[PDB]
Design a protein around this ligand. Structure first.
Ligand SMILES: [Ca+2]
Ligand SMILES: [Ca+2]
Ligand SMILES: [Ca+2]
Ligand SMILES: [Ca+2]
Lengths: 108, 108
């Protein structure tokens, strides 16, 4: 769903880097795919894509499918990767990621 | 110190992938640099290189310098990366990584 608002080469490269089980690193991914330099406006747009049910949060089920937003046939994250990613972003410990928590994950 | 027993391109590619602060993932690295398919004999050789003082263990100070074994001017791992890496490998919880713990980190 971004393929068009991040460049295709960056996406490709970001996915190939984490093809192996447990090789995902969200900072590595965000840097390679090019989100880290994006405006807060574009980051909010990205958030909304990942929030598949538009609940206002990325719940754990959605985070597991994180890569599939970028390329539909991408692998699911392992449970291990998902928890690590949730724990880095979930600042208030409610077990989900809201928009400002996502912006911080991307940016800092 | 491997530049010669892993190929230069793989090393280069592995380092570029984790140039950003906190972007290191040891499974991603090991896969890209090509150690994961290596024999137990070559893995032991790699271990010995990383064990800079030849104590028989990679202590935390040595793990922080992990990348510098591959390319001398590579960055140090952050404290965050170092702890994560130590905690994935330190199976017996003595705070250092021995040869069989290293072989498991690489292989499985
Ligand atoms: Ca949601
Ligand atoms: Ca939260
Ligand atoms: Ca040592
Ligand atoms: Ca140990």
């Amino acid at each position: 769903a971004f393929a068009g608002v991040l460049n295709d080469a960056d996406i490709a490269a970001a996915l190939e880097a984490c093809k192996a089980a447990d090789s995902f690193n969200h900072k590595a991914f965000f840097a390679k795919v090019g989100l880290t330099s994006k405006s807060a406006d574009d980051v909010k747009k990205a958030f909304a894509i990942i929030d598949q049910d538009k609940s206002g949060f990325i719940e754990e089920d959605e985070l597991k499918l994180f890569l599939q937003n970028f390329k539909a046939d991408a692998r699911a994250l392992t449970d291990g990767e998902t928890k690590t990613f949730l724990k880095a972003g979930d600042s208030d410990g409610d077990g989900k990621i809201g928009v400002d928590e996502f912006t911080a994950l991307v940016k800092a």
